[PDB]
């Protein structure tokens, strides 16, 4: 499903992304915005046999198993299909594991270019939460 901005913000807060390892809610909202426009069903095929799945476009080359990707490391130990759910539980958990690496949110190129070092709080300002 496609979330409303504030709706996703509240959901992400419920799922404990606000201030997770230092990253304020805004960062994740902004990231979701540029990666999939808040669409849980968003997918993107790459030149290799990998696809980006979910609201945070998590790549199947390293993070999930789609049962048909050459070199599946399945870092998140999860079926890529879980990342397309209307329930964001799986996408958040995997994002938390990804961000637990040293590079933090830099794993998301879109976040670096469009959110890193900005007034990210703007992405949640106005929302009733």
């Amino acid at each position, epitope marked *: 499903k496609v979330f409303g901005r504030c709706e996703l913000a509240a959901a992400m807060k419920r799922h*404990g992304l606000d201030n997770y390892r230092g990253y304020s809610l805004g960062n994740w909202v902004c990231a979701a915005k540029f990666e999939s426009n808040f669409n849980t069903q968003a997918t993107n095929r790459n030149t290799d046999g990998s696809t980006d799945y979910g609201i945070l476009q998590i790549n199947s080359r*390293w993070w999930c198993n789609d049962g048909r990707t050459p070199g599946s490391r399945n870092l998140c*130990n999860i079926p890529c299909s879980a990342l397309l759910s209307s329930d964001i539980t799986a996408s958040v958990n995997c994002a938390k594991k990804i961000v*637990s*690496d*040293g*590079n933090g949110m830099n794993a998301w190129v879109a976040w670096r270019n469009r959110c890193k070092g900005t007034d990210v709080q703007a992405w949640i300002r106005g929302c009733r939460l």
Partner: antibody
Framework: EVQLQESGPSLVKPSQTLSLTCSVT????????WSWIRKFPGNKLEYMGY???????YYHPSLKSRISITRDTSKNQYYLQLNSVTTEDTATYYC???????WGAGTTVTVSS | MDIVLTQSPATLSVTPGDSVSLSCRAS??????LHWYQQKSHESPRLLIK???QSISGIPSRFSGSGSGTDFTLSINSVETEDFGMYFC?????????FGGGTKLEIKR
């Protein structure tokens, strides 16, 4: 099924170095984030640190200085190194997945002269 | 700065069949980033609930977790004979990760 197993010297002398090995079976060491957790007497647990899929690491600040976590991709093991130990480092040591789903049986390391 | 987790009661004595609730409080808000572990004598810790209330496929249904922020609760609907031992909470919201002092679940007689 993924399984872990700790191994190493059960006795370390003060000022010396404590070394432990965690053998990963069932999956690849490069395919997950792995940790070292120690349990002091009196049920006091301390999350020592973890090494990610890339090889990057995070160490507990109180330990930062004496700790080192590494891995060996061909052997499928990751290690713990703790320098200048003192009787205070006597504890039961466990290796576990970052996700917390798999834990080794744990091994006791005693620091004494 | 390091987040401190306080668990209570330190010890709890119950009869198999009774239900119980264990508390874990954080010195700083941690949202849902609180995990519950069980460790019985001579055994390694076992993850029971992750992220405050998410269940783990394979963990008995009598175990459940609730709470958010700084107050969390592990509930056991009708404790069973194999459920006695230590219970610890751990937060993964900020590094370093930290554990509460644990609560001992013991047999009432």
């Amino acid at each position: 099924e993924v399984q872990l197993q700790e191994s190493g010297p059960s006795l370390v002398k003060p000022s010396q170095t404590l070394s432990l090995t965690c053998s990963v079976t069932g999956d690849s060491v490069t395919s997950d984030v792995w940790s070292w957790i120690r349990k002091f007497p009196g049920n006091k647990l301390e999350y020592m640190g973890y090494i990610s899929y890339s090889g990057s690491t995070y160490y507990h600040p109180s330990l930062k200085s004496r700790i080192s976590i590494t891995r060996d991709t061909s052997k499928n093991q990751y290690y713990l190194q703790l320098n200048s130990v003192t009787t205070e480092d006597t504890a039961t040591y466990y290796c576990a997945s970052w996700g917390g789903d798999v834990w080794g049986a744990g091994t006791t390391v005693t620091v004494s002269s | 700065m390091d987040i401190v987790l306080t668990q209570s009661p330190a010890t709890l004595s119950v009869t198999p069949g009774d239900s119980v609730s264990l508390s874990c409080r954080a010195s700083q808000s941690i949202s849902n980033n609180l995990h519950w572990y069980q460790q019985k004598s001579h055994e390694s810790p076992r993850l029971l609930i992750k992220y405050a209330s998410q269940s783990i496929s394979g963990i008995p249904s009598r175990f459940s977790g609730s709470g958010s922020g700084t107050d969390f609760t592990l509930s056991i609907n009708s404790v069973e004979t194999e459920d006695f031992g230590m219970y610890f909470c751990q937060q993964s919201n900020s590094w370093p990760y930290t554990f509460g002092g644990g609560t001992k679940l013991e047999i009432k007689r």
